[PDB]
Amino acid sequence: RRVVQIAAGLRRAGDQLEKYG
Amino acid sequence: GMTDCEFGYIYRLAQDYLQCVLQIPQPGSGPSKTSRVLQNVAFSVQKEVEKNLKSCLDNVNVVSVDTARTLFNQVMEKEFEDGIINWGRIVTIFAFEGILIKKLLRQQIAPDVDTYKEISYFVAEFIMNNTGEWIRQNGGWENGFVKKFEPK
């Protein structure tokens, strides 16, 4: 579970940065 | 340029970012324009992720370079399993290696000064093998990444 949680957090941050950066 | 998607260039970016996080500036010409732009953006992401995932990251102990590598590869696999690559996600790869090196600094059982060079290595391996073609098709670091993230 921790692997999935970390990965999802990174994916979310990257997709947000992609649109707002 | 087009060769900036090859291993050596990516390794240098990954190493530069870890040296930034560890506060060990290396003397000489100084980091590239790419690295200078990347360090600011990746660090901003790193601090956000460290805050958003603090409860979870405290439940993982990064006690060796081998655990760091397995965890990095496990996380990268799940992060990218939807087949989507974009520059924002590439930034998060550097942010995550910065998280790992800070945990290693505190938790590594037998610390070694060359550890950040091993971390940088497996980070570059993932970036090159799994995103390198996308990077090249999108202008590389100089004509893609820097153009997106440099100041206006």
From Swiss-Prot, chain B:
Pfam families (UniProt xref): Bcl-2 (PF00452)
Compartments where found: Cytoplasm
CDD domains to which the protein is assigned, alphabetical: Bcl-2_like
Motif (BH2): 133-148
Regulation: induction: By phorbol ester and inflammatory cytokines, such as TNF or IL1B/interleukin-1 beta, but not by growth factors.
GO cellular component, one term: cytoplasm
Classification via Gene3D superfamilies: Blc2-like
InterPro entries: Bcl-2-like_sf, Bcl-2_BH1-3, Bcl-2_fam, Bcl2-like, Bcl2_BH1_motif_CS, Bcl2_BH2_motif_CS, Bcl2A1
Tissues and organs where the protein is expressed, per its UniProt entry: Seems to be restricted to the hematopoietic compartment. Expressed in peripheral blood, spleen, and bone marrow, at moderate levels in lung, small intestine and testis, at a minimal levels in other tissues. Also found in vascular smooth muscle cells and hematopoietic malignancies.
Protein name: Bcl-2-related protein A1
Protein's organism: Homo sapiens (Human)
